[model samples]
Target: GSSGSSGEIAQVTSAYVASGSEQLSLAPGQLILILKKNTSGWWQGELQARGKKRQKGWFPASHVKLLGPSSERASGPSSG
Candidate 1:
C-alpha cells in the first residue's frame, strides 16, 4: 500500500492493483481513512476495493492516492 499527502482521509481518483498484482479497482471518490504515517511523512490507510467486497489492508504513501491539498487556501483570488 501507499501513503497520503497529509494526515487525514482522502478519496482515490484512480485505480490501483493489489500487492500480488490482484485487481483492486478503487473507484473515484472512494473514501479512505489514514491510520498511520509513512516513512516519507505521508499518511497511510486502507482501501475497500471492488464495491467494498474486499479489504486490501494498509497501503503505502504512493498507493492510496490523495485528492486535494491538505493546507487551507487564502481568501480571494490569486494575483497571478
Candidate 2:
C-alpha cells in the first residue's frame, strides 16, 4: 500500500543547501511533503528518509515542482 500525505507532494528540481537552521536541505530528485505553501516563496515541508521519521523544515518553494493532478492528461501524442 502506498501511503500518501494529505499535504501536497513535490519533487525537488534544484538542490537547496540549507543556509540557516530554520531551513531544510534539499537535493535534486528528492521527494518533499509540502505542508504549507507561503506567498513569500518559502514553503514548509518534510523530507522523508525511507522507513524513518520525516525531517520537517522550511525551504524555498522555487526549488520544487508540486506533483499535483495535471489539468491536461493526454494532450496529443507529440509535445515540445
Q: Which one is best on lDDT?
A: 2
Tens-digit lDDT track of model 1 for 41-75:
34445553344354444444454565454446755
TM-score of 2: 0.72
| lDDT computed for candidate 1 | 0.53
Off by over 4 Å in 1: 1-7, 20-25, 40-43, 48-56, 63-80
* Top candidate when judged by TM-score against the true structure: 2
* TM-score (C-alpha) between model 1 and the true structure: 0.44
Candidate 2 wrongly placed segments (more than 4 Å):
1-5, 51-53, 70-74, 78-80
Q: lDDT for every model? A: 0.53, 0.80
What shift in Å separates residue 42 of candidate 1 from its native position after superposition? Answer: 8.0
State in Å the error of residue 60, model 2.
0.6
